[PDB]
């Protein structure tokens, strides 16, 4: 199927700062990936983003009832829906599972990578740090970065490139909003 | 900002596909199944705390369809440029032999929102237990999508996620195997 495609998108966005203390509403219209016209609650009228959206901006701004619907959205739409979903979205907290296992940077070579696997947590903000015998190790740390799993959980792998010596104790430390104190996991050579 | 909630919609020609969903900070709250006219919550628990009248989504999609007709003419029938996906396969937890796990195929940064995705086990299509998300919006107004395959890890099986998209010259296969 080589037939040309044509796409329309609309995004009605509610942006929240400090709960519902400060709220911004965006009514956004798209042709393919190109935003062509938008209502910003900061402005209170539609504005063309590209030339393609000028006829709609002028037409929509001539409709007073429509504009007042859009102008009230921060209250009737954004603050309302926030209230509806707050208990299972804003307040959602799921603890990370933390696993440490050794790995290899190159096949055949001895174990030279320590993986701190942090799984199943929500929300996404997390800080993972490595320690060797009580000292933070900041060199040789590489990560997958923050991975969304698509099911309201995140995961991340944080690896420490190191050559483990007998006796050494490594510690992976995890800080996250769901925790009241750091979560630490030890690994011994 | 602390949080963002987005009601995201699209309508696509000539496929006549239209989607309606709510996004919270990048996760899907729910979408509306247009054929069934039903609200589908991403996590089942959500529907115990909130409701949504699916019929309302239908009205918006009808307007989006009509708006697409208008904008297509206005653009002098300029079609979309295909953007092929990035594909990644990962597990949702550390793999242990014969411990139930889940393979995730993440299909990202693509448009239009049409893709064929197949899970392969030892080169063979598998459909038992698979699941998938709808098309999810990106801040750059491309799309992403997730496919899932529960599996029992073994040394005897290899997996691939196979993705077909009009922006690709050949199907994209991303491999996974134990080790």
């Amino acid at each position: 199927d080589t037939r040309p495609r044509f796409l329309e998108q609309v995004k009605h966005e509610c942006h929240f700062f400090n709960g519902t203390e400060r709220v911004r509403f965006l009514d956004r219209y798209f042709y393919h990936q190109e935003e062509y016209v938008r209502f910003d609650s900061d402005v209170g009228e539609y504005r063309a983003v590209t030339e393609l959206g000028r006829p709609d901006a002028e037409y929509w701004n001539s409709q007073k009832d429509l504009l007042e619907q859009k102008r009230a959205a921060v209250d009737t739409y954004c603050r309302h829906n926030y209230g509806v979903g707050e208990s299972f979205t804003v307040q959602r907290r799921v603890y990370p599972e933390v696993t440490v296992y050794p790995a290899k940077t190159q096949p055949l070579q001895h174990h030279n990578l320590l993986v701190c696997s942090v799984n199943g947590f929500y929300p996404g903000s997390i800080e993972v740090r490595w320690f060797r015998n009580g000292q933070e190790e900041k060199t040789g740390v590489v990560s997958t970065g923050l991975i969304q799993n698509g099911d309201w959980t995140f995961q991340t792998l944080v690896m420490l490139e190191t050559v483990p010596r007998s006796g050494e104790v490594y510690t992976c430390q995890v800080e996250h909003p769901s925790l009241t104190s750091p979560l630490t996991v030890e690994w011994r050579a | 900002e602390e949080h963002v909630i987005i009601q995201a919609e699209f309508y696509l020609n000539p496929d006549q596909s239209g989607e309606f969903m709510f996004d919270f900070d990048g996760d899907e709250i729910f979408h509306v199944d247009m054929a069934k006219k039903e609200t589908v919550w991403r996590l089942e628990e959500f529907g115990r705390f909130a409701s949504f009248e699916a019929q309302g989504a239908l009205a918006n999609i009808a307007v989006d369809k009509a708006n697409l007709e208008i904008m297509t003419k206005r653009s002098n029938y300029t079609p979309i440029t295909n953007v092929p996906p990035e594909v990644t396969v990962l597990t949702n937890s550390p793999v242990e032999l014969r411990e139930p796990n889940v393979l995730i195929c993440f299909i990202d940064k693509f448009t239009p929102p049409v893709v064929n995705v197949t899970w392969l086990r030892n080169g063979k299509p598998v459909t038992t237990g698979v699941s998938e998300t709808v098309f999810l919006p990106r801040e750059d107004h491309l799309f992403r999508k997730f496919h899932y395959l529960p599996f029992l890890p073994s040394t005897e099986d290899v997996y691939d996620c196979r993705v077909e998209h009009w922006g690709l010259d050949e199907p994209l296969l991303k491999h996974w195997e134990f080790d």
Partner: peptide, 13 residues
């Protein structure tokens, strides 16, 4: 309770 939706606006012409 009930999640509300925002209307999509019919375009000109």
């Amino acid at each position: 309770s009930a999640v509300r939706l925002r209307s999509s606006v019919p375009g000109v012409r």
